[model samples]
Target chain A: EEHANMQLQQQAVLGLNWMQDSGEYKALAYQAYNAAKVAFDHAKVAKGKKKAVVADLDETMLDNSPYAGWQVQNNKPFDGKDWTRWVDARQSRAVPGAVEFNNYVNSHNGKVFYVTNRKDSTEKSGTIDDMKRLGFNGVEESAFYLKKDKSAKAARFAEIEKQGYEIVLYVGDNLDDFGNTVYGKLNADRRAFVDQNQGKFGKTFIMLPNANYGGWEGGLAEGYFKKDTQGQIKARLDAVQAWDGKL
Target chain B: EEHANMQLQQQAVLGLNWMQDSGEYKALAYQAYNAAKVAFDHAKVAKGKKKAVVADLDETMLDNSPYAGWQVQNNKPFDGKDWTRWVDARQSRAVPGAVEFNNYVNSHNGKVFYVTNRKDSTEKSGTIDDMKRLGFNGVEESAFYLKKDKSAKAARFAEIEKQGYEIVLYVGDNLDDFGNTVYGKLNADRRAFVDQNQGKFGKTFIMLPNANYGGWEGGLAEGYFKKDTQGQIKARLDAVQAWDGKL
Candidate 1:
């Protein structure tokens, strides 16, 4: 009965943003942040003196559903001009519990790295400026790792390590933001990996919830680049390896 | 011996691009990829059936030193419009073993996610389109994780997880693309964390080389945002935390 309208899932994500103030989204954000708080404290004890926290920039810290709201309305994938215009406005707010968390880390002598792939060319100086304008602290222009061409963060993570700080905690909404630990391991294995490392969840790695778009959607597409919306639906259905659980 | 002009480091990165064919960059890339291959094999037996590999798009798969080649000659920071034009040309080639690795994964029934933070809006549809043009299989439109406002990939990583992929292998030039675990953690602790997880590298997380630009430079900047090029150089020098062996 629920097999049709695969776009429903995408719509559902957009829905979370629209109802951010009234629905489960807000609670979810709070839940994620709270977990991060516990994780942050847990790491503090085991970590070295030079404490550093690596974090994703988007939904992890900045609430960008306003941007998503427009995208869904316009029915476009994503437009850079609109995004730049929006950034020029500097009106985006911090994700719920994000500011408090940043403050938490700052007060604790931890340096926060907005290890975002945001580019210096597109956003240029505006990247750091917009972050500062939006109430984020420690937003140095250089602090932004900015996008090169690839998404693997191993190099950036290594770069930070080369700087002589102790990376005790990480905060992000995706797994790639950590490293490619479970990148293509399938749902069951990825789940097991997470379960296996349950101690790291929220303790060493703080996570934030982002329902809009992510790696899963593509996986559902089976890494097929030419798939259209419909292709995506089929790939998604085919990608499902769940048990039938028949009688 | 490495503590000369400091900016010499930047020049060294340039040197790699200039000497890609004649120099050791190719060998280094091969070494990294070879290590990843062995590591990949090692994990397959212990890993479950649903295998996946997440990789960075640039140096890991697509060789973009041409862009860096020009940048060093011109001595300019990255420019999005220029990057967009270069991407539009679709001239970038695959890293040495990247295409082979991609095919190997596919044949093994494993999935690969490019997981790049490139912006779709900035590059338009050309980002994914170019990957296909460049010999990269599975370059789906949804495959490229174009950065929204924030450059983090955690949400995207989590998104893949929510869908049901195991994400067994991760590849990238930067660390943030991995996860937030080592995102901004200090160099010291980040190293220890890696030391603690020796088996994960090359096995679960296959990394490639990218010296042109990354987060390490920013860390050398000490999280200062307002620096110009020379300002960056000065900051880099000021942030050095080297140890003296004279004791």
Candidate 2:
């Protein structure tokens, strides 16, 4: 059992390394935000509606890599308790270009509301404090739609709209952040959603790269998140599609 | 030694899984191509110069995840012979939006030139055949500057420019694909290059995601590519920045 846990955590090493140490990762982050800025500049709203941009927090605007680093080093699976504690630690960094982009929207007649899955009851203060320290503008309580009863985000997106704001763009690292269509479905359905809305990316659905974790992990198998460590490892291995080493 | 090799290959599991199976990965691919098309439309060249787009082939426009899958299943490290064989197998798939984007550039006023490190001596026939089968236009011999004696791509970029075409954009999965500035440098220097060209991404420099492998692997440590399996594993683990698990 311990070995399975070690193996699972070890499997995450290269990805975490890429996220924390590679320029390509940073470049992708900058690219997403730059594209978002252009999309924001071109967006329009109805006469009675205010302009707004909905963004996911962790791995989108925030850099929680240290927490992922801790996972790799300690062979820990994701635990809400550990994550909440990490959040309370108040050490999250800002993803490249995220702060600038967020500020740009707030200053340029658009409100950037954070529609993150981070827990509102326990993780809010730390998240807000970290955002303030990391130079994000509009960290006020009203600008956030953190997780409360459910983890699905489309409800929060609608809530933003209910307040008379037109969400011109949605930025995230997960497909679920865009809507409820692929919220709990498998990867194939999620990919179908992306394919169906192919032209929207970089125009209205901005994305930041997050290989460490997301809905995609759960998309690997039926009830993947409910699987044991060894089962999860097997599912990951089974998902790989290999060439037969022959012509 | 075998265990070291196994560990190294195992480390790539989650990332490979992410690359091959995730809708998020597909979305990022479409996003990159979509952004590239926008940049291409907005681009203007010098008077009397034809418009050209320089693109790297492997992970940028081609999907070789099966090769990565083979590596994971067989516990094989990357070998030139293995790669050459894989190339000749002609089973390469097109990245989700790559074929449409490539054909778009060709059908429009601009031309798309492939600047790749795939060996011209042995890999050309298979690459062209696969691309032709995969629906990429302009697979003619004249459009490619495949590797001869060099892997740095700036020379090839210049070669395309010398053909009386002004290269408007460079599409790649690696920072090294853009130019020679950070060609063989470590991660910090490579990141410095990205930081310096922060505004170019998604504009003049379109990036595709490839978590499986790239120049960033070598960027982990000095002489990283030259290191043995165990050494490479150590370098990857050493690069992770962990939280101390404190309050």
Candidate 3:
């Protein structure tokens, strides 16, 4: 029953965003890019600061489903070694719609910086290679914001801003990479930030669909503060919802 | 920024089902019950077995919004006292349009089983009284299936079935209350089970609105197995989708 429950829960997570070839998954990326195209088309014509497109690498531009799939299939929790192995493989496919958006940005003279938290100490150069191989143009080592003891990507975003490009558009699957406004927020706070800035969705901000795994799920589970221990974790899970019918 | 993230996450959970004047919450219950009335009217005439409506309490037949509200209002996790205070107050109002359906069942020779898992040894009778006071006309002390042991409510459901009442209609906020088929299955199983039983919805299974909290959240948070440490819990939470661009 426990195994069945786990399998069921895993399936539930995937059912919404994975498995089914429903256009829902494809539409989110397509819609985001379509919005991007429209915004870029307008921005390019406007007389103002030169534009730069800040995008998240994983899930936003690159489809890391294979890595996430491996974890689920193996029934293994994330280990640094396992993740590092996946990263070293440098084998992620491009989100097809994202490629179109990236190409458009490159053609329009907008700087496309893949500001991901894929950690600089390792895989930074490999990520560059992976991006290049995946047909993602505008691959520059400096453009990749590998982790440097900072959780917020606003500094990385700022680096691009210092180069005199107005960050007219931002794209990511997670809210944290978008900027400090959403970075490192507790689960509840992150949700509200999106609500307040919903007007930016598909306009200045394009969010990709990633129900397989992301911070949204984690924060929702644990809230802001991390609770360590099986009991506490169980308690955290209990805090949400239950079919237990136990009060 | 930390605060911003926390706020956003909070909003995200409540966006669709909790706090909105948009009438989405009201419509879900109203529409679900409206469908229930239609289905019950059709089923009562053709049903051969003694009909009974097995409903999970909390958000299904009774509106425990006050308890949920106090938790949010106090930033407190659910506890016996919180629940007892809510129940002992005898103040939960009826879900709009629920009483009419209960009355209809009673008048039509159909029985109603309030198969909930509210486990307060002291408050069992009070729970019955609260239900009766809240306009749950057919509620009886014998029918209140308070917890005798563990989480699953199948035993209570079985007791109802043994009483020779064919459970023509099952109602609840959570999936477990519907039947054992979905009771202990993990998140994925429950979702798929629902898909398989879609025809039963509004026909033999009536699910009420419960966006405030439930097992779906916990199962999704912890995955299938128990991860009993901060790191494991963190990993489990990471197994979910996020706006965190920390790829």
- Give the alpha carbon lDDT tens digit for every residue of B1-247 in model 1: 2222223333333123222421123333443455455556655533334666778787678776666545533444566767776776656677766777787776676778767766667764666766677676777665566677767778777776655677777777665666776565434444444445444544465555454455444434345334555565455334432212111
> Which 10-residue window in model 2 chain B sums to the lowest lDDT?
B154-163
Better of 1 and 3 by TM-score: 3
User: Cα deviation of A125 in candidate 3 (Å)?
Assistant: 2.7
Q: Could you tell which candidate, 1 or 3, scores higher by lDDT?
A: 3
TM-score of 2: 0.99
Off by over 4 Å in 1: A1-247, B1-14, B17-19, B42-49, B239-247
Which runs of model 2 end up more than 4 angstroms from their true locations?
Answer: none
TM-score of each: 0.45, 0.99, 0.48
Model 1 docking category: incorrect
Q: Chain B vs. true chain B: TM-score for each candidate?
A: 0.81, 0.99, 0.80
DockQ ranking from best to worst? 2, 3, 1
* CA lDDT for candidate 1: 0.56
Query: What lDDT score goes with residue B18 in model 1?
Result: 20
Native-referenced DockQ of model 2: 0.89
lDDT of 2 at A4: 84
lDDT over C-alpha atoms for residue B232 of model 3: 30
